[PDB]
């Protein structure tokens, strides 16, 4: 659940989502769930041909990368939290 | 907090599949694994009609946009 | 179980870990868990077979992902 | 939902995930859908494996032959 | 008869193990579990359709994830 917490930390933030299908999508992280599905608002090309769409829902198991900014993350907390998790 | 496809319910949507294909339909039901119940399904690369009512499995779905 | 006891008898042994891709890893096995994750030291990679052209050599321990591991053989 | 009991000692057709057709006579089974087949012939042309166990995990489809 | 009883039966015998791919393993069954992670002894690895990839010596933990068919002998 570590990364669910992490992703909850970037709500309202701009993110770049790279699909396993080579589709890239920039937009504002509105929502995450347990499977790491993402709901984005205000999406834009950084990309497929779509019509007029504002909100999307991505399936977690189909993402390769989410691009972030270093400003968006206290790496210290990330590491210490990662040290806590049990494997 | 959690993410629900609820805000898309009974509305027209775009689906992108994992094979990269595109669909247009109306979302009339979904589950946790994001299997979908869709109505008036149309392919976009051919604008060809596909189904009046079809059940689409979650594992095929990359993406759902509202339109 | 017999499979779990394999996993305490071969630790420190020289193993060939093959992945789904067919990529073969040979090393001394530092550690191993249940999900078939693996740690190896002095690991050499090859494709498919030990006697093929060496593709890489790792001066550090190598972590191998369980869900990728096809078998863990010993020599 | 499928009672394999009615397929016992019958020739069945079993499609495996990976593109692997297997034909044989059902001789046993469990609830995970692991099969025991006899006079087994696998197609991927064809060869005759004798008495085989099929994992239910990679079972994709079952019918009669 | 139960599938898992047939596999218990064939313990310490020759076994062919077929993956979902064009690759198999002949060897002597030494063990298995509920997930059918198999332990083989001196296994001969093949690519079919044939190539003898390897001749292993010792014990091999063959992951159950991709096992498709078990053939005693």
């Amino acid at each position: 659940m570590l990364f669910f917490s992490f992703f909850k930390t970037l709500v309202d933030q701009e993110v770049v989502v790279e699909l396993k299908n080579d589709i890239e999508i920039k937009g504002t992280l509105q929502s995450v769930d347990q499977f790491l599905n993402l709901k984005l608002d205000n999406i834009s090309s950084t990309y497929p041909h779509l019509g007029s769409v504002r909100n999307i829902f991505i399936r977690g198991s189909t993402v390769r990368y989410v691009y972030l900014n270093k400003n968006m993350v206290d790496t210290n907390l990330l590491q210490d939290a990662t040290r806590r998790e049990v494997m | 907090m959690s993410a629900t496809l609820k805000d898309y319910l009974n509305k027209r949507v775009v689906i992108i599949l994992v094979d990269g294909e595109s669909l247009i339909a109306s979302l009339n039901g979904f589950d946790k694994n994001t299997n979908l119940f869709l109505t008036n399904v149309f392919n976009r690369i051919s604008k060809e009609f596909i189904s009046k009512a079809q059940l689409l499995r979650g594992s095929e779905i990359a993406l759902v946009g509202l339109i | 179980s017999v499979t779990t006891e394999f996993l305490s008898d071969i630790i420190g042994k020289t193993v060939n870990v093959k992945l789904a891709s067919g990529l073969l890893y040979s090393g001394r096995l530092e550690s191993i868990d249940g999900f078939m994750n693996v740690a190896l030291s002095s690991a050499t990679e090859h494709y498919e077979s030990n006697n093929n052209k060496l593709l890489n050599k790792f001066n550090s321990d190598v972590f191998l992902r369980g869900t990728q591991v096809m078998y863990i053989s010993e020599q | 939902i499928l009672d394999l009991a009615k397929y016992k000692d019958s020739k069945i057709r079993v499609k495996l995930m990976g593109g692997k057709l297997v034909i044989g006579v059902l001789k046993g089974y469990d609830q995970l859908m692991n099969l025991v087949l006899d006079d087994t012939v696998e197609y991927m042309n064809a060869r005759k494996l004798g008495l085989t166990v099929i994992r239910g995990t990679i079972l994709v489809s079952l019918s009669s032959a | 008869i139960l599938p898992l009883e047939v596999i218990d039966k064939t313990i310490n015998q020759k076994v062919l193990i077929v993956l979902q791919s064009n690759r198999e393993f002949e060897g002597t069954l030494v063990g298995f579990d509920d997930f059918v992670n198999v332990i083989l002894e001196d296994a001969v690895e093949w690519l079919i359709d044939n190539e003898k990839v390897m001749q292993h010596h010792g014990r091999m933990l063959l992951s159950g994830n991709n096992i498709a068919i078990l053939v005693p002998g």
Binding site: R64, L78, M87 | - | I32, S60, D61, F63, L64 | - | -
Partner: protein
Amino acid sequence: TPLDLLKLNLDERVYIKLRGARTLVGTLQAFDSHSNIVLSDAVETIYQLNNEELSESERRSEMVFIRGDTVTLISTP
């Protein structure tokens, strides 16, 4: 145990192998049990073949979340 030995080199540069001729190198900010990864100052290397010739390509990001399913081998460069 191997996941704990990975805890060893946090904040240290690591070398990741993904599936599909991809490679990443970065400092390791956070990981878990499916080997979902966060990297800082990453650089991704894809190797492609165009017109039957090998061509590499680079890609750089400051902060990157990596889905675990594709990850093959994590080590140190």
